[PDB]
Amino acid sequence: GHKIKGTVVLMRKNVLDVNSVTSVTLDTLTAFLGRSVSLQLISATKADANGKGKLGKATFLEGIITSLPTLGAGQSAFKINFEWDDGSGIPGAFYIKNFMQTEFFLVSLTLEDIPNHGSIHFVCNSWIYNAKLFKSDRIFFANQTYLPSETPAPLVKYREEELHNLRGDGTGERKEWERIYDYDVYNDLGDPDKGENHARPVLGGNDTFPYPRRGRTGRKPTRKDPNSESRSNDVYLPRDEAFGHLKSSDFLTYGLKSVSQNVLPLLQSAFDLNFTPREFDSFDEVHGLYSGGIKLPTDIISKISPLPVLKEIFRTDGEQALKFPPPKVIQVSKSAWMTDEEFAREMLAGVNPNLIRCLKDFPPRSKLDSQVYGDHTSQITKEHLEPNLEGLTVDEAIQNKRLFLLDHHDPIMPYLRRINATSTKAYATRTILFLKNDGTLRPLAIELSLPHPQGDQSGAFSQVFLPADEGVESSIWLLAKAYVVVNDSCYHQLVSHWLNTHAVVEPFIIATNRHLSVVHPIYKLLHPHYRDTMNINGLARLSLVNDGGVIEQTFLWGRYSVEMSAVVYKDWVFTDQALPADLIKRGMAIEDPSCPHGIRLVIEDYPYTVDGLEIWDAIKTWVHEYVFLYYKSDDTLREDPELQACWKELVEVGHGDKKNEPWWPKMQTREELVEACAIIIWTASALHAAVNFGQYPYGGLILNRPTLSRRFMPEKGSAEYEELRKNPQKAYLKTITPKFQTLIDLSVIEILSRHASDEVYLGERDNPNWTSDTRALEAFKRFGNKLAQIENKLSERNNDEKLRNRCGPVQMPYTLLLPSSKEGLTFRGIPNSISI
Ligand SMILES: [Fe+2]
């Protein structure tokens, strides 16, 4: 015989829930001690009748273990001594039953053994509901990573049964307690039944609007059309994908849900009433927003204070003033944002640093069909480029790759005639920039295009504006740049941030969980990079991207916003997301072996990329060491049933609209798996951090990143032109985002740029001890240590005076891609996952 000693570490529901956490021995713990929680061991050695493990007698939990050197916060440990003997062999898993009717978060189980066998660890981290809601029993497996042979033969059937239980068929309305994973189409976002005007086109499953699938939540469809699904306030996402917190303001999801639920209506009211004016009359009135805040009544102020998590997001006077924090962009100079040098610098080191291209043939073309400006070009004034700096000719400078383009002409042009039928007067833009002889970039022309003055075949109504610094000229130029910037803010929310990151990544979470058992080595590589992404994504469909959401209301594309993001999905090709691939695709880097990342950069002074290539290569070296420690040969891989099922399923199903694309890796080689895995970790950690954490630092001055255009360019000698002349600022303010959306936008982007105190960053942070594989842990440490070396290289780079696109006119050292951050609206820190 032998009693194996176990110590079960756990967390009680109230330690983790928002509704209790509203506050951040005492033997609650006694309740666990009746015939309340029972565990039961499973062998990885002795096999019953038809192989299936062998279950050592259900044991209940006795005695509270008061301390342990390792207990941590909100965790309770319990002791449980299992009866066991030589003849049952080694425990490799365990069943668990909660009878308490209050779920608890199981953290771990350690067994201190009986043969020459060290302490077996189980890293559970999962919610255990009441044993009656389940029809089977929650099984948990030990610490050992096994390739999909499903290795210890007693375990093989237990390994395939859970896999089967997490897929759980595509039927029914998913409940709070469920862990079923499956795909569905974006048919979730509109509400047809509150009017036809409230319908939104189903995204995915068709060619006009292809889209990545999202998690199936199983609700009853809409009444006025069965193809869409009923709205609801609680969107299901598989339990344990929804992450608890020990303190609030860490419930940053709660910040967003209540900003839309409660804050946006009560605030709305002051603009539908009168205590606030509706337009800002001066740049001064905007800068006063984080000086004294917005004088509002206590009917909004006491109502919008104690609502949890939205503390410090709103700095308050105490009463009648909701302040905002100064965004980093004006902390050294309140006026440097207007600088050409800055507008051009944010294309490389800004919130959206990701899009610029080396112009190869002038004039840039559209890539729009037979409606003949696609089969035609940019009307840009070749004979109006280079205002003082270098006087080369066009091809001399294209030979030198000194000209670059921000082309925002094509995604919005189909929808422009419609966006301009409403209240917003958008302007399809492109802008040619010349790399100043000293490393900086300089905007030489913006081309403001409209559709179809008389028609729509040969429909491009282009007007190019050129830089100037005195009089109406500079005021017109400023509004011109304002029209680029507003286009780049919808492109950044809907495509660079939500599409290229949150939407694209959710099929992988669903496919991984449905097919790669927890034990699998690849699953443990990938798992930490999925933390809360299905949860924040559940809330985006509930509030951010739905029928009357903040994005529809706050961004240029308006109601056509996510549909336009699905048209651009037409072009998303998985492999060009890989950073050096992306830099080449855009003609920002040429291949060159000699140069330290296998490619040479045009605009070498370029921060996002110089820094990010460092983090890419670090991820790629980690994943290659990890992959190659389990796969012996390419045949090992090709034979892996769990990896193969997985890849098959997200190509054909999760990214089902794209199933037939020729660029997809067939997972037949290692190095193809290094590449797929390296791209998903990049997207889930450094791309989303790069694209998301500079949002308030830059976009907190609505002046510097406006989201909405209300007027077309001031005409000739007309009273709008005369208003410019006699009051440029009031003219500016009434072209860009009105004040009620400026206030909604700074609330939502303030939250989106916040690091929760319990953020697990890329910087080596896993979160307990996930594997037995010493080789892996060691390799993990090398990753973590290379990242610390990277952070120092990157900060050293911010002090090189010869690198000025790192800082620019309002000395804002590019810190977005430094791995660690402490906790706030810190402009750095790469999380492991898309979490906000
Ligand atoms: Fe995000």
Side-chain angles (χ1 to χ4, degrees):
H2 203 266
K3 279 184 143 291
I4 298 187
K5 288 174 182 183
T7 147
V8 158
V9 199
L10 167 168
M11 273 184 124
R12 289 161 300 188
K13 195 198 171 181
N14 269 246
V15 157
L16 266 38
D17 205 19
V18 59
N19 299 331
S20 44
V21 168
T22 223
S23 258
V24 142
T25 175
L26 208 176
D27 248 74
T28 45
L29 318 198
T30 279
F32 294 85
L33 273 17
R35 274 183 117 256
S36 320
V37 181
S38 67
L39 291 65
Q40 169 161 36
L41 268 36
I42 297 186
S43 324
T45 332
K46 263 81 177 202
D48 79 325
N50 230 280
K52 249 213 175 212
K54 208 195 82 292
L55 298 70
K57 315 309 163 189
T59 313
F60 288 77
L61 223 66
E62 165 33 51
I64 301 149
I65 312 188
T66 330
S67 210
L68 302 330
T70 227
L71 257 192
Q75 313 200 157
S76 309
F78 288 89
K79 28 185 168 182
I80 179 174
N81 276 41
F82 302 101
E83 253 72 319
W84 202 247
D85 48 312
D86 298 30
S88 290
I90 312 178
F94 77 92
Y95 277 136
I96 175 165
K97 308 198 71 183
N98 172 13
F99 298 112
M100 298 181 95
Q101 200 145 249
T102 272
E103 65 258 49
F104 48 75
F105 187 63
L106 192 64
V107 180
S108 54
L109 173 69
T110 296
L111 303 178
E112 306 192 332
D113 224 47
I114 157 196
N116 214 350
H117 213 294
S119 309
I120 301 180
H121 214 100
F122 294 66
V123 169
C124 304
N125 288 322
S126 184
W127 283 87
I128 308 299
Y129 276 69
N130 188 283
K132 69 213 160 212
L133 316 182
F134 283 102
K135 75 186 193 176
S136 325
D137 266 314
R138 309 271 285 103
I139 189 181
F140 290 108
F141 302 95
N143 205 217
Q144 289 79 263
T145 173
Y146 296 119
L147 259 209
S149 298
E150 310 196 316
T151 294
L155 266 29
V156 103
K157 273 172 176 170
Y158 288 104
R159 180 156 163 174
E160 44 199 45
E161 189 187 53
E162 249 261 297
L163 229 43
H164 172 82
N165 284 248
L166 281 335
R167 296 168 193 130
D169 200 32
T171 23
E173 199 194 0
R174 294 285 142 258
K175 309 298 174 190
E176 182 192 85
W177 28 289
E178 295 198 319
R179 308 149 65 228
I180 272 77
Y181 290 82
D182 211 350
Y183 314 83
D184 211 7
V185 154
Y186 280 67
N187 68 141
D188 200 307
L189 291 73
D191 192 10
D193 289 0
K194 182 181 289 172
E196 49 261 12
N197 160 249
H198 294 220
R200 216 97 306 166
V202 55
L203 263 35
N206 71 76
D207 301 336
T208 323
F209 289 135
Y211 223 56
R213 302 293 94 111
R214 44 110 199 164
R216 184 178 177 272
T217 181
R219 298 166 241 125
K220 47 162 300 306
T222 246
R223 275 147 143 242
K224 289 220 80 191
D225 80 301
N227 307 325
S228 315
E229 114 174 66
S230 288
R231 294 246 102 189
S232 185
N233 268 307
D234 300 306
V235 302
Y236 160 91
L237 48 124
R239 252 316 208 166
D240 323 341
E241 228 50 79
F243 284 87
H245 303 290
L246 233 51
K247 303 200 299 178
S248 225
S249 189
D250 286 348
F251 282 91
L252 289 170
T253 31
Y254 231 63
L256 289 335
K257 206 187 169 175
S258 294
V259 128
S260 308
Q261 229 78 302
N262 313 117
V263 181
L264 195 164
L266 308 169
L267 204 89
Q268 186 182 92
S269 302
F271 290 86
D272 301 351
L273 192 152
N274 199 249
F275 288 112
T276 19
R278 293 177 171 240
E279 240 71 72
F280 294 112
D281 294 285
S282 60
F283 283 2
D284 310 293
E285 201 172 308
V286 182
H287 290 281
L289 192 29
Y290 32 74
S291 313
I294 180 149
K295 215 172 185 190
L296 205 66
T298 323
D299 307 273
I300 297 62
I301 268 69
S302 293
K303 300 204 180 186
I304 61 160
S305 171
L307 17 64
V309 183
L310 293 79
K311 41 176 159 165
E312 208 286 288
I313 284 91
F314 310 129
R315 300 181 170 204
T316 191
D317 171 47
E319 216 167 88
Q320 309 317 63
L322 177 81
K323 318 165 198 164
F324 279 97
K328 257 230 173 243
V329 73
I330 73 305
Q331 291 190 356
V332 168
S333 169
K334 286 65 187 166
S335 36
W337 73 264
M338 284 177 307
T339 280
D340 279 4
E341 308 87 87
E342 187 55 18
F343 155 81
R345 213 258 305 164
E346 287 188 31
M347 294 187 190
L348 311 167
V351 71
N352 196 50
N354 184 32
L355 187 61
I356 189 175
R357 303 174 167 271
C358 195
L359 200 55
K360 293 313 177 183
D361 42 54
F362 188 80
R365 314 166 183 175
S366 161
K367 199 189 133 69
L368 277 152
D369 245 303
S370 53
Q371 276 68 114
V372 238
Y373 49 87
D375 344 280
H376 198 147
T377 25
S378 307
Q379 280 184 212
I380 270 181
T381 46
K382 177 188 285 182
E383 23 289 286
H384 252 167
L385 239 37
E386 273 91 79
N388 57 12
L389 195 278
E390 251 278 275
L392 305 83
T393 33
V394 152
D395 196 59
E396 195 162 290
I398 293 180
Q399 196 190 76
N400 297 197
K401 287 164 183 184
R402 276 175 156 265
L403 285 172
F404 303 88
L405 162 84
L406 211 241
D407 190 313
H408 278 296
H409 199 85
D410 296 287
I412 180 167
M413 190 66 109
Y415 284 81
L416 198 43
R417 63 198 230 165
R418 275 177 277 180
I419 283 161
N420 293 160
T422 359
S423 337
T424 285
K425 304 285 182 304
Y427 246 128
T429 60
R430 292 161 166 145
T431 147
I432 262 75
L433 304 97
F434 181 45
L435 181 60
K436 231 184 292 164
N437 203 196
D438 81 297
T440 36
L441 190 62
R442 195 201 187 183
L444 265 45
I446 315 302
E447 171 183 341
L448 297 203
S449 333
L450 289 165
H452 67 210
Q454 298 97 76
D456 208 18
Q457 305 231 289
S458 244
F461 197 18
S462 321
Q463 320 184 45
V464 327
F465 293 83
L466 233 81
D469 71 295
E470 333 249 349
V472 203
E473 303 69 86
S474 26
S475 301
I476 281 203
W477 184 235
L478 185 59
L479 281 104
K481 287 188 304 192
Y483 295 116
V484 178
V485 184
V486 61
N487 289 202
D488 197 63
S489 305
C490 301
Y491 199 91
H492 177 261
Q493 276 299 336
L494 281 308
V495 183
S496 268
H497 170 232
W498 167 264
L499 172 66
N500 286 181
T501 237
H502 291 249
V504 141
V505 177
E506 190 158 344
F508 294 102
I509 308 180
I510 301 176
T512 304
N513 283 83
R514 286 165 64 72
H515 289 292
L516 241 46
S517 176
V518 283
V519 159
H520 201 108
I522 286 312
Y523 169 107
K524 306 190 177 187
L525 172 71
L526 255 26
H527 199 246
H529 294 291
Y530 294 162
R531 194 197 222 238
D532 245 4
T533 306
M534 278 191 107
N535 178 207
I536 199 272
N537 281 356
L539 161 87
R541 311 191 316 246
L542 195 84
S543 301
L544 278 18
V545 118
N546 64 330
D547 183 63
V550 309
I551 283 174
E552 283 197 6
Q553 286 191 76
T554 310
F555 289 88
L556 194 77
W557 291 358
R559 56 161 288 193
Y560 304 112
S561 277
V562 189
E563 310 162 22
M564 284 198 246
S565 82
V567 168
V568 175
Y569 177 57
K570 273 204 173 74
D571 306 319
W572 176 89
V573 18
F574 188 57
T575 48
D576 303 341
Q577 307 281 275
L579 183 63
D582 188 78
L583 239 34
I584 290 166
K585 193 194 182 162
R586 289 160 39 209
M588 285 316 278
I590 59 178
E591 288 205 283
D592 188 335
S594 333
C595 304
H597 284 119
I599 43 168
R600 189 283 192 71
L601 250 149
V602 329
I603 307 180
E604 182 176 283
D605 321 86
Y606 189 178
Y608 164 74
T609 264
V610 178
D611 294 23
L613 229 23
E614 297 295 320
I615 282 165
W616 172 256
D617 274 76
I619 285 155
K620 208 182 173 167
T621 302
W622 160 235
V623 149
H624 181 98
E625 284 194 42
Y626 196 91
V627 163
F628 281 78
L629 207 53
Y630 290 95
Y631 297 107
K632 287 174 180 154
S633 46
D634 292 338
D635 285 57
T636 314
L637 187 148
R638 305 197 249 268
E639 296 167 289
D640 182 331
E642 283 177 22
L643 185 74
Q644 298 310 147
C646 170
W647 197 243
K648 202 213 192 299
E649 197 179 72
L650 70 297
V651 175
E652 298 170 11
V653 201
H655 270 285
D657 291 349
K658 262 165 162 60
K659 79 181 76 171
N660 269 100
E661 291 298 330
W663 41 256
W664 282 115
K666 286 210 166 194
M667 207 57 108
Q668 243 35 228
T669 316
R670 294 175 302 192
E671 217 40 59
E672 266 183 296
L673 178 65
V674 176
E675 235 52 44
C677 280
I679 287 151
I680 307 167
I681 310 320
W682 175 257
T683 302
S685 61
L687 188 46
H688 176 274
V691 147
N692 183 93
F693 283 103
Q695 283 192 89
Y696 200 87
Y698 288 116
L701 226 223
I702 193 86
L703 258 37
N704 175 237
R705 296 284 294 188
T707 65
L708 206 153
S709 309
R710 278 181 303 148
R711 299 219 284 137
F712 295 121
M713 206 64 236
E715 246 288 79
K716 294 198 178 75
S718 332
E720 342 303 330
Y721 195 100
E722 216 63 60
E723 201 184 26
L724 266 180
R725 283 238 263 265
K726 288 169 174 193
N727 192 356
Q729 301 195 161
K730 180 62 197 197
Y732 191 74
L733 276 327
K734 63 190 199 216
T735 311
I736 67 145
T737 326
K739 177 179 167 177
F740 177 56
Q741 286 88 291
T742 295
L743 287 154
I744 287 161
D745 185 48
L746 282 22
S747 307
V748 172
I749 60 173
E750 215 196 307
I751 289 185
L752 263 46
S753 311
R754 256 185 184 66
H755 291 293
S757 341
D758 64 345
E759 186 74 282
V760 174
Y761 301 86
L762 191 73
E764 124 271 290
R765 277 167 239 209
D766 236 77
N767 68 124
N769 231 60
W770 54 289
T771 197
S772 325
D773 201 310
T774 294
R775 315 170 301 176
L777 275 358
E778 220 87 78
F780 190 47
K781 284 289 179 173
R782 258 166 300 174
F783 174 53
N785 178 247
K786 190 145 63 291
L787 242 26
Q789 179 181 135
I790 289 310
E791 182 168 35
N792 285 162
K793 197 172 303 155
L794 275 46
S795 309
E796 190 201 271
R797 296 230 195 63
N798 293 157
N799 276 110
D800 190 358
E801 2 77 79
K802 315 151 206 85
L803 292 182
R804 265 318 73 137
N805 304 344
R806 287 191 70 78
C807 282
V810 54
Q811 296 105 265
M812 186 159 170
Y814 188 69
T815 254
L816 240 23
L817 226 34
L818 251 56
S820 321
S821 160
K822 65 189 195 183
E823 204 215 321
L825 194 58
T826 324
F827 162 70
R828 59 199 199 109
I830 289 168
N832 281 300
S833 70
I834 299 172
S835 41
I836 187 55

